[PDB]
Amino acid sequence: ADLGTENLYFQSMKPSPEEAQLWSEAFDELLASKYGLAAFRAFLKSEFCEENIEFWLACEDFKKTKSPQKLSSKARKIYTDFIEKEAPKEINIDFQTKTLIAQNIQEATSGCFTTAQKRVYSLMENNSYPRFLESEFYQDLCKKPQ
């Protein structure tokens, strides 16, 4: 086979078959793995619905925020990207969840996006994740060579 620089680079970003197989155990496990996260995002991007997972990741970064100053500004950015009318990464939430967020941006807390996040989480967990696991792409990641 090839031990060329290009190919090695690409192999270095593939998970082992072993670790990919473990992503079937639980959604949280897929997400806690850097490779599993990248795999899931690529599956979703191929189906033009990567915004849910990008949304979810930004809410995780947001939850970990300990400053009220940057917590208000992160909330405005998340809003701009994922929540407002015609946002590039617009998610599907109800007009009344959006309202509450928009109402809360000024005095944002760690749970500004919990309602929206949980909807999006459960969306992915019960929907895109099972489809991920059945994909030809994920199967090949799990296949041991030879």
From Swiss-Prot:
Limits of the RGS domain: 26-142
Cellular component terms per the entry's GO annotation: cytoplasm; cytoplasmic side of plasma membrane; cytosol; mitochondrion; nucleolus; nucleus; plasma membrane
Entry superkingdom: Eukaryota
Record has Mitochondrion as a keyword: yes
Any single biological process term in GO: negative regulation of glycine import across plasma membrane
Keyword Cell membrane in record: yes
Consequence of changing residue 57 to A: Near loss of EIF2B5 binding and inhibition of in vitro translation
Effect of residue 92 to A: Decreases GTPase accelerating function but has no effect on translation inhibitory activity, suggesting that its role in translation is independent of its effects on G proteins
Any GO MF annotation of the entry: G-protein alpha-subunit binding
Coiled coil: none
UniProt keywords, alphabetically: Cell cycle, Cell membrane, Cytoplasm, GTPase activation, Membrane, Mitochondrion, Nucleus, Phosphoprotein, Signal transduction inhibitor, Translation regulation
Chain spans, region Necessary to inhibit protein synthesis: 22-59
Annotated tissue distribution: Expressed in acute myelogenous leukemia (AML) and in acute lymphoblastic leukemia (ALL).
Effect ascribed to mutating residue 30 to A: Near loss of EIF2B5 binding and inhibition of in vitro translation
Impact reported for residue 33 to A: Near loss of EIF2B5 binding and inhibition of in vitro translation
Description of post-translational modifications: Phosphorylated by protein kinase C. Phosphorylation by PRKG1 leads to activation of RGS2 activity.
Outcome following mutation: residue 29 to A: Near loss of EIF2B5 binding and inhibition of in vitro translation
The protein's role, per its UniProt record: Regulates G protein-coupled receptor signaling cascades. Inhibits signal transduction by increasing the GTPase activity of G protein alpha subunits, thereby driving them into their inactive GDP-bound form. It is involved in the negative regulation of the angiotensin-activated signaling pathway. Plays a role in the regulation of blood pressure in response to signaling via G protein-coupled receptors and GNAQ. Plays a role in regulating the constriction and relaxation of vascular smooth muscle. Binds EIF2B5 and blocks its activity, thereby inhibiting the translation of mRNA into protein.
Assembly, per entry: Interacts with GNAQ. Does not interact with GNAI1 and GNAI3. Interacts with EIF2B5. Interacts with PRKG1 (isoform alpha).
UniProt protein name: Regulator of G-protein signaling 2
Protein species of origin: Homo sapiens
Upper classification of the organism: Eukaryota, Metazoa, Chordata, Craniata, Vertebrata
Full-length numbering of the shown residues: 71 to 203 of 211
